[PDB]
Amino acid sequence: RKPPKGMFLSQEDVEAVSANATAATTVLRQLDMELVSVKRQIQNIKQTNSALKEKLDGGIEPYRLPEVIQKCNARWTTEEQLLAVQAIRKYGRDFQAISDVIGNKSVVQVKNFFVNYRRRFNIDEVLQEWEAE
Amino acid sequence: PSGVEGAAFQSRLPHDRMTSQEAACFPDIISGPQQTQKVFLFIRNRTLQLWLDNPKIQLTFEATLQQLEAPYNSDTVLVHRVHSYLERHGLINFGIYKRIKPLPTKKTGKVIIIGSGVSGLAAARQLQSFGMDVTLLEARDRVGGRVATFRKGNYVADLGAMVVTGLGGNPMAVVSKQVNMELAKIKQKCPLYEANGQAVPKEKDEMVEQEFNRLLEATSYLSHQLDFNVLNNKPVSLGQALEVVIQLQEKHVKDEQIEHWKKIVKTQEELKELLNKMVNLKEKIKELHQQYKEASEVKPPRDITAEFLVKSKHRDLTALCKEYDELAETQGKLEEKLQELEANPPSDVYLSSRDRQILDWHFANLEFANATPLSTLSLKHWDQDDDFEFTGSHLTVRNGYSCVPVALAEGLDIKLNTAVRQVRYTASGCEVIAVNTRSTSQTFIYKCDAVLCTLPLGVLKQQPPAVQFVPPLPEWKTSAVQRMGFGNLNKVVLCFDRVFWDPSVNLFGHVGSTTASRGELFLFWNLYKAPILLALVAGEAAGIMENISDDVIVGRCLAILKGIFGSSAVPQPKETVVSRWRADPWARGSYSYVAAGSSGNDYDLMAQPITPGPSIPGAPQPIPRLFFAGEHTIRNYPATVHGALLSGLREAGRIADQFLGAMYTL
């Protein structure tokens, strides 16, 4: 029903090697050239990727900023409220950002703010203004 | 197998079923109820055993019935029918037995037997066994034909057949009990030695051997499962199909190599796209820092927009630092795959020049067993005889296989140095015209009721004919002759004063340099009591080495031996003979082979006798007059001694049936 294992004898393949006298030698050159062509392509990417890899020498250690460990608070200094509105103008509804900007506010307090301070700060207008970008 | 059932197996007969042969003579029984078949089968298997247990003495019908027991020895015509059948088709009292009833005083019928090789001898002895008048005409000055044994002083070596291919249902088993053949088992260990002169390492030996055997099953698969049997209107041969199998393994290797590297590139390019996204991120992060640095430089106390800027830039820079960290994470997983993929490359070659050369030796061995270039073997049928292989070890005939022809020949009318030249067969009888090989002017004429031809297939093949058939053989027989293959292999006997090889290894190989030369002296045999090596010449090498002097040939032997054993341990051989079987005018080759375009059925055609046309027109259909035996006529055992002998038994049965009557068919 099936060949010995490892032998590879499909109808399709057999035909294509018997088609003419050298149809076998042809097929086995269209593959040596198909192999050298890929190997030279592999060298090209290896050189290209070796160049992009030196531009990242040293990584981003020089641009790293130390961790701000600050315990989250519940009250809203007017300073904290002013930061808020101005982050909404910059960040829409990305509460994670806004929570990151203000720094000692949990992501829920941030969304809670959107309701309590909404009418007093025209948040619609602020979000509406931020939509046009 | 053992018992009565073992006698059936040892006679190549199913112990529990009736053969087509027996249905012919016993159509009452095989068409009758199952119980009577069992009695008949028991009588056949019993009788066989009695002969097989003691084949040095004729098995008479009385002897047989005496030792059968009821219910079986109750019907005496059933026993007489069975025993006469067996005697007639040579399943019992064949060979060289002592006879109880000495020979009928006056004979009936005259048969001329062309050729005194084993098939000839074996018929002759059976026909005379049956009360006929037999004369054999032999072109050589000796009997045995292709069973040739060189003898000089104390050296004995066979230039012809030298191996008994197992005693497991082999008629030669019976012959060896009858004649003193000293049979010696042949140990299969065969170390291969490359052209440098040193052993192929065991890992290489097993690797090629396994690839070889796998390659063979692949051809079989191509034959039976893909019907790859005709290419460009010509039948495919074994050789063609081995190429196409090897090519498709070489193509697979390239195909797999190509798929491996196409995963490196498809990953080298995810990395490429990843680094681009990271070189851009680092540059974006560079600018963000500077913007945050400048915003931080404005010293406090600041207004809230300017405090928001420092806070906002810091948030944006941490976000872009999360991102670039997630990416040199991803850069590590894809850098690891590239190292892992690179370390696991697929196989570089299918076979190396060294691997292929050893493979070429395994092909020479296959060209040896078939005495022909693999390009001539029928892919579909070259192995159609393998189902009937005997069981057990192969053996050599340590005292020379000619002892068997010579033994068969005693008590027989053999004209030596008599070359048949024309066979004339008519509705009323036959005349064979032969000449004397020494002075061909002297001409002889032999009249007879029937001619039994054992002319080698190579001889039957000559154009122009060495033997003329009058009237010419019909096209159906002459076409089988052309279609069949008659191959060639030759031996070089080397006779030394000194044992300098391994006395415990019976055979050993030499690996050739080229495909083209894979058969030149590729195998050596240590079979004999005395110091004798025997070197084989197979494949395309065979027919080319017959154009080369013995010294050049013995030279190339000593070369090969010096390399494999050291250039000072190999002395000069005392005696050397080099066979040239395709040159031999009474052989024209070594033995037959299923040629591409032939089948095993051609072997059946070769055995079909020839019936002449009527002399008087409108006279009744005559008797068959020309009968054929020999190695190329027995489908299930060609190219062998045992096959020859069986064919001789077979015609002598059927000739006796034709000319003396089969009283056992009623």
Q: CA distances (Å), B311 to each of A53, A89, A103, B315, B327, in order?
A: 32, 14, 9, 6, 25
Helix (H) or strand (E) holding B600: helix B600-607
Say if CB A39 and CB B261 are below 8 A apart: yes
In this structure, is the dihedral angle defined by the CA atoms of residues A12, A13, A15 and A19, taken in order, positive or negative?
A: positive
Query: Is the Cβ pair B268, A49 closer than 8 Å?
Result: yes
Tell the burial category of B214 from Cβ atoms under 10 Å away from its Cβ (0-12, 13-18, 19+): middle
Residues in B touching A52 (Cβ below 8 Å): 272, 275-276, 278-279
DSSP B134-153: EEEE-SSSSSBTT--EEEET
Say if CB B317 and CB B293 are below 8 A apart: no
Could you tell me which of B641, B297, B310, B128 has the C-alpha nearest to residue A68? B310
SS3 B664: coil
Say if CB B149 and CB B401 are below 8 A apart: yes
Could you tell me which of B361, B550, B590 has the C-alpha nearest to residue B457? B590
Side-chain half-sphere CA neighbours of B90 within 13 A? 29
Could you tell me which of A38, A19, A16 has the C-alpha nearest to residue B256? A38
Say if CB B308 and CB A83 are below 8 A apart: yes
Q: CA distances (Å), A60 to each of A54, A64, B278, in order?
A: 13, 6, 10
| Domains in chain A: boundaries | 11-55, 78-131
Whole-angstrom Cα distance, residue B627 to residue B295? 117
Pick A14's closest partner by Cβ from B226, B254, B255: B226
Residues in A touching B259 (Cβ below 8 Å): none
Whole-angstrom Cα distance, residue B420 to residue B553? 34
Side-chain half-sphere CA neighbours of B629 within 13 A? 30
Gap from B545 CA to chain A (nearest CA, Å):
30
Query: Is the Cβ pair A18, B317 closer than 8 Å?
Result: no
CATH code for the part of the protein at B4-88: 1.10.10.10
| Domains in chain B: boundaries | 4-88, 110-147+402-486+588-660, 249-343
Q: How many residues does chain A have?
A: 133
Structure method: X-ray
Question: Hey, do B110-147+402-486+588-660 and B249-343 end up sharing a CATH topology, with the first three levels equal?
Answer: no
The topology (CATH level 3) of B249-343 is Helix Hairpins (1.10.287)
The structure tokens listed for B554 are 């013995």
Q: CA distances (Å), B222 to each of A3, A11, A15, B380, in order?
A: 9, 9, 11, 9
Whole-angstrom Cα distance, residue B529 to residue B537? 23
Could you tell me which of B76, B92, B1 has the C-alpha nearest to residue B39? B76
Q: Does B322 touch chain A (CB under 8 A)?
A: no
Say if CB B195 and CB B513 are below 8 A apart: yes
Whole-angstrom Cα distance, residue B239 to residue B364? 12
Tell the burial category of B471 from Cβ atoms under 10 Å away from its Cβ (0-12, 13-18, 19+): exposed
Whole-angstrom Cα distance, residue B163 to residue B185? 10
| Crossing angle of the two packed helices A78-91 and A107-116, in degrees rounded to 10 | 90
What's domain B110-147+402-486+588-660's architecture? 3-Layer(bba) Sandwich (3.50)
Tell me which residue has tokens 């087509």.
B20
Residues in B touching A1 (Cβ below 8 Å): 225
The DSSP letter of residue B481 is H
Tell me whether the omega of the peptide bond preceding residue B474 falls within 30 degrees of 0, making it cis.
Answer: no
Buried b (16+ CB within 10 A) or exposed e, B412-446: bebbebbbbbebbbebebbbbbbbebeeeeeeeeb
B129 alpha-carbon distance from chain centroid = 33
Q: CA distances (Å), B13 to each of B8, B21, B44, B50, B86, in order?
A: 5, 10, 10, 15, 12
Share in percent of chain B as helix, strand, coil (round to 5): 45, 15, 40
The three-state DSSP-derived secondary structure of B415-451 is: ECCEEEEEEEEECCEEEEEEEECCCCCCEEEEEECEE
- Which CATH number among 3.40.50.1460, 1.20.58.1880, 1.10.3470.10, 3.40.50.720 corresponds to the domain A78-131? 1.20.58.1880
Was B514 annotated as part of a binding site? no
Query: Is the Cβ pair B315, A65 closer than 8 Å?
Result: no
> Quick count: other Cβ atoms within 10 Å of Cβ B629?
33
Say if CB B626 and CB B453 are below 8 A apart: yes
Instruction: Specify the pairing of strand B523-525 against strand B507-509.
Output: antiparallel
> Which residue is closest to B276 within chain A, CA to CA?
A52
The DSSP letter of residue B524 is E
Query: Is the Cβ pair B261, A38 closer than 8 Å?
Result: yes
Best of A30, A40, A53, A63 to mutate (most B CBs within 10 Å, chain B): A63
Gap from B276 CA to chain A (nearest CA, Å):
7
Helix (H) or strand (E) holding B490: strand B490-495
To one decimal, the resolution in angstroms is: 2.9
Say if CB B229 and CB B236 are below 8 A apart: yes
CB pairs under 8 A between A and B: 140
Gap from A108 CA to chain B (nearest CA, Å):
18
Residues in B touching A41 (Cβ below 8 Å): 265
Pick A64's closest partner by Cβ from B249, B250, B321: B321
Side-chain half-sphere CA neighbours of B614 within 13 A? 6
Please list, in sequence order, all residues whose beta carbon lies within 8 angstroms of the beta carbon of residue B461, skipping any fewer than 6 positions away.
B481, B482, B486, B588
Say if CB B351 and CB B252 are below 8 A apart: no
Residues in A touching B254 (Cβ below 8 Å): 28, 31-32, 34-35
Whole-angstrom Cα distance, residue B509 to residue B495? 18
Instruction: Specify the pairing of strand B450-453 against strand B110-114.
Output: parallel
